[PDB]
Amino acid sequence: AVKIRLKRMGSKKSPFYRIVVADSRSPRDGRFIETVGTYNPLKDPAEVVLKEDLVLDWLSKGAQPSDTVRNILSKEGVMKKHHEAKNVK
Amino acid sequence: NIESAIKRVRTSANANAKNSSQTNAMRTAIKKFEEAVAAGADNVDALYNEAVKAVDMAATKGLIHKNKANRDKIRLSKLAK
Amino acid sequence: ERNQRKVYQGRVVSDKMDKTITVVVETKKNHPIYGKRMKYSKKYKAHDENNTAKVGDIVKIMETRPLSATKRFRLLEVVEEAV
RNA sequence: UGAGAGUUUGAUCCUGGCUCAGGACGAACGCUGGCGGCGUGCCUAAUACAUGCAAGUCGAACGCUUCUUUCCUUGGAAAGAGGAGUGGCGGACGGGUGAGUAACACGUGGGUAACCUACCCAUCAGAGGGGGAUAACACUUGGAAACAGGUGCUAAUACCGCAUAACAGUUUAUGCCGCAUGGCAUAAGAGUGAAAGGCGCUUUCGGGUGUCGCUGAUGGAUGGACCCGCGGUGCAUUAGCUAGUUGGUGAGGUAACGGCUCACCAAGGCCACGAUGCAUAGCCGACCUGAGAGGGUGAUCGGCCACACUGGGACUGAGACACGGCCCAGACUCCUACGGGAGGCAGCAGUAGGGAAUCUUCGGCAAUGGACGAAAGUCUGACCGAGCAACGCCGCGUGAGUG
RNA sequence: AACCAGAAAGCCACGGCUAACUACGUGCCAGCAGCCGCGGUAAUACGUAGGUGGCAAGCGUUGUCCGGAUUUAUUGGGCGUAAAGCGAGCGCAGGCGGUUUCUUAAGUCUGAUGUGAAAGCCCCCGGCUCAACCGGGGAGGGUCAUUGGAAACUGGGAGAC
Numbered sequence: 001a002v003k004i005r006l007k008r009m010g011s012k013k014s015p016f017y018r019i020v021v022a023d024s025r026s027p028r029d030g031r032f033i034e035t036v037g038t039y040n041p042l043k044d045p046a047e048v049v050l051k052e053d054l055v056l057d058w059l060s061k062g063a064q065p066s067d068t069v070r071n072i073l074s075k076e077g078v079m080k081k082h083h084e085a086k087n088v089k
Numbered sequence: 090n091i092e093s094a095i096k097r098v099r100t101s102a103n104a105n106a107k108n109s110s111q112t113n114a115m116r117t118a119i120k121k122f123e124e125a126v127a128a129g130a131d132n133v134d135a136l137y138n139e140a141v142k143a144v145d146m147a148a149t150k151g152l153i154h155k156n157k158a159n160r161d162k163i164r165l166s167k168l169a170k
Numbered sequence: 171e172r173n174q175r176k177v178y179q180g181r182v183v184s185d186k187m188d189k190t191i192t193v194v195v196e197t198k199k200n201h202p203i204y205g206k207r208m209k210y211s212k213k214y215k216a217h218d219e220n221n222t223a224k225v226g227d228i229v230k231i232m233e234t235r236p237l238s239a240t241k242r243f244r245l246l247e248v249v250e251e252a253v
Numbered sequence: 254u255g256a257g258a259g260u261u262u263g264a265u266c267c268u269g270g271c272u273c274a275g276g277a278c279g280a281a282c283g284c285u286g287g288c289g290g291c292g293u294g295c296c297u298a299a300u301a302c303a304u305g306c307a308a309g310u311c312g313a314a315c316g317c318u319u320c321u322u323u324c325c326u327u328g329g330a331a332a333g334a335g336g337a338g339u340g341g342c343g344g345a346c347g348g349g350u351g352a353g354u355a356a357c358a359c360g361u362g363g364g365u366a367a368c369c370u371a372c373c374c375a376u377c378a379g380a381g382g383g384g385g386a387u388a389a390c391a392c393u394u395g396g397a398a399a400c401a402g403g404u405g406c407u408a409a410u411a412c413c414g415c416a417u418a419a420c421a422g423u424u425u426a427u428g429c430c431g432c433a434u435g436g437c438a439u440a441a442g443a444g445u446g447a448a449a450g451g452c453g454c455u456u457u458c459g460g461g462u463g464u465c466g467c468u469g470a471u472g473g474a475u476g477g478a479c480c481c482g483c484g485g486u487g488c489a490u491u492a493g494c495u496a497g498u499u500g501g502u503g504a505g506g507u508a509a510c511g512g513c514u515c516a517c518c519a520a521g522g523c524c525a526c527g528a529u530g531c532a533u534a535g536c537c538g539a540c541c542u543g544a545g546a547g548g549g550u551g552a553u554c555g556g557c558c559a560c561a562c563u564g565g566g567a568c569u570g571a572g573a574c575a576c577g578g579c580c581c582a583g584a585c586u587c588c589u590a591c592g593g594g595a596g597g598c599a600g601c602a603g604u605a606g607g608g609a610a611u612c613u614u615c616g617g618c619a620a621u622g623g624a625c626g627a628a629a630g631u632c633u634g635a636c637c638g639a640g641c642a643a644c645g646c647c648g649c650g651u652g653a654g655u656g
Numbered sequence: 657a658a659c660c661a662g663a664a665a666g667c668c669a670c671g672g673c674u675a676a677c678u679a680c681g682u683g684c685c686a687g688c689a690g691c692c693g694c695g696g697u698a699a700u701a702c703g704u705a706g707g708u709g710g711c712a713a714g715c716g717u718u719g720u721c722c723g724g725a726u727u728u729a730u731u732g733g734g735c736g737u738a739a740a741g742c743g744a745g746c747g748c749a750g751g752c753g754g755u756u757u758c759u760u761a762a763g764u765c766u767g768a769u770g771u772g773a774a775a776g777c778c779c780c781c782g783g784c785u786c787a788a789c790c791g792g793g794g795a796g797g798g799u800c801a802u803u804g805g806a807a808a809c810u811g812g813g814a815g816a817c
Binding site for chain 2: 308309340344369412413421422423424443444445446506507508509568569570571577578579596597
């Protein structure tokens with residue numbers, strides 16, 4: 001059940017999120033595989049940097065992103081290019 | 090304490106009963122084959138085919154998982170001829 | 171094939187057992203605190219194929235797979251024969 | 254990037270011990286006591302625990318039953334809500350503690366022509382047709398209780414048999430290749446399943462069809478297992494230890510090689526480069542200190558390993574020899590009609606005790622992450638925040654001009 | 657945006673080592689002290705008072721670890737008289753070895769590949785009004801494994817003096 005999701009690094013009141021693929025058995029900030037991109041919640045509009053090249057060949061291997069990951073990957077056409085590459089091809 | 094896992098105990102007891110029955114059926118099949126070949130009387134092929142089909146059903150219906158079934162078909166084929 | 175085993179080169183102590191010899195490898199290591207070239211040895215246990223090995227003779231060996239109760243190597247070639 | 258002083262003598266110079274100036278603390282005690290931000294808080298008895306909460310969920314698998322409603326009002330459809338039970342999935346994750354352990358337990362580099370893998374993606378092939386039960390239910394039996402039976406009826410994606418499926422495994426032959434045993438490709442010789450299911454749809458007899466499920470094989474992915482070189486601790490006023498030990502043959506067994514276990518044969522194996530024994534300790538990322546080589550330590554936080562009152566055992570399951578699962582023995586606590594039963598805070602708060610000494614029996618799923626479910630949702634002492642403590646670190650105050 | 661200098665400072669030392677001295681009382685009693693050593697009537701060493709000196713919402717005491725400690729000395733000590741060459745000899749094992757030619761390449765050096773999880777230390781930048789803190793971007797740490805080179809030294813093999 002490989003799965004990409006969030007992981008936070010903030011202090012007490014102001015979080016800061018990194019997107020990182022972890023196995024689902026692991027804890028919230030436990031071990032993982034590799035960090036791919038991060039997520040700043042604060043300072044709206046939301047500020048996201050992604051490597052976005054491992055992600056295509058790392059979803060084609062098959063992993064299920066969570067819901068906040070789904071919104072912030074829909075905001076860059078990630079799933080767009082995913083089904084444009086898989087179904088459409 | 091016991092909370093809601095008492096549902097699993099009944100399931101495991103029923104699985105014990107029927108798994109014991111089916112595996113003892115397989116063991117008496119193979120035992121009958123061995124006692125048949127060791128005397129070497131007539132009617133040697135039918136109980137051989139029965140033992141093969143019994144190992145197959147024990148692999149498929151219940152569980153061994155795959156591999157003791159393969160090893161038993163090998164060591165039972167070498168015992169046949 | 172990606173990589174062979176780590177083959178070792180040594181010599182023989184005993185050969186009394188059937189298909190089985192006793193191989194010594196030996197090299198140098200520095201001391202942790204000080205620095206001279208002290209040397210030491212390890213004894214391994216290979217497996218001869220037809221008991222044709224020699225008492226005290228140069229040979230080389232290869233990692234194989236766990237074949238018996240703590241012996242693991244196999245004979246490859248007598249590198250140098252001694253009288 | 255390296256700062257020396259006192260102290261033996263009536264006075265001197267050497268060699269030499271002892272004390273002082275530096276910094277750190279999960280620290281405590283004394284005196285004194287404003288606030289704000291960020292962290293930290295049983296090291297001692299792995300001592301005994303009252304109380305409250307810490308894992309459940311799916312009606313779109315299956316019947317049953319209760320209540321509230323316009324439904325032909327004596328009955329009625331449908332809807333809403335409640336309850337118990339068969340069935341699937343998760344309770345092996347997430348949290349806690351270092352008691353054991355001097356070893357492939359850890360760290361690092363390797364290996365599998367000795368290996369397995371539920372959930373998630375990819376591909377090919379199927380999804381034919383039968384059969385018998387049973388919980389609930391209704392009635393009764395024995396019991397202080399814990400609950401155990403009996404008779405009769407009922408359903409399924411529960412169960413069982415028939416058929417069909419080599420694409421799996423074996424052997425033969427051909428070719429290609431390899432680290433002996435061997436691996437790969439092709440053509441032939443013997444035996445295996447299904448939910449046949451659900452939600453809906455265009456849908457005229459019709460029965461074609463979408464989605465979520467079911468079954469066989471092969472790959473990707475994550476996760477688990479085994480084997481090897483190297484390195485990390487004192488004692489010689491601890492020098493011999495070992496019979497399934499060492500090797501072979503065959504058989505059994507394991508996912509998987511193997512004395513893993515048996516039967517037979519031969520007596521081998523390890524040690525002064527420290528075997529064996531004895532004592533102490535979980536191991537690393539790291540932390541303090543130092544010019545550096547080093548020396549000391551392993552609390553937070555990240556990884557691995559081990560343990561769940563003590564000691565044995567297996568079953569279900571893809572996955573435990575199982576942290577709020579079962580059985581047995583033992584110590585301890587409780588109930589009893591004496592016949593017999595119930596139990597395990599090293600989960601969160603708290604209690605009692607030990608101590609020089611370490612917190613509130615708090616609020617909430619809004620965020621992130623799990624589990625179930627098509628979705629809404631339900632659970633979540635994980636977590637998010639609040640409260641206590643000059644414990645550490647940081648910042649700003651207890652006016653100021655003239656006088 | 658209004659009111660208020662108003663409610664807001666204690667702790668240790670003062671003989672040398674080590675910045676800071678004077679009165680009164682005690683009288684080798686009482687007491688003090690890290691070490692030296694101070695008190696039998698005149699004590700900067702005891703008790704108080706004044707002043708001073710060092711810190712500051714902290715100051716002191718206790719306990720532990722590292723430095724100073726070249727006091728385990730590889731860097732970095734020695735052995736005539738101060739601790740310290742066995743009473744002397746023969747020898748297994750072990751350590752260290754004359755000169756040269758050729759060869760190997762284990763040690764030694766060097767290049768490339770993979771690896772040293774994340775957070776910590778360090779360097780640059782960004783954000784809380786700075787700081788503490790947080791975030792982004794880099795290097796470090798093996799006696800590490802594979803592969804390609806070098807041949808002065810050491811080792812291994814062949815000769816020669």
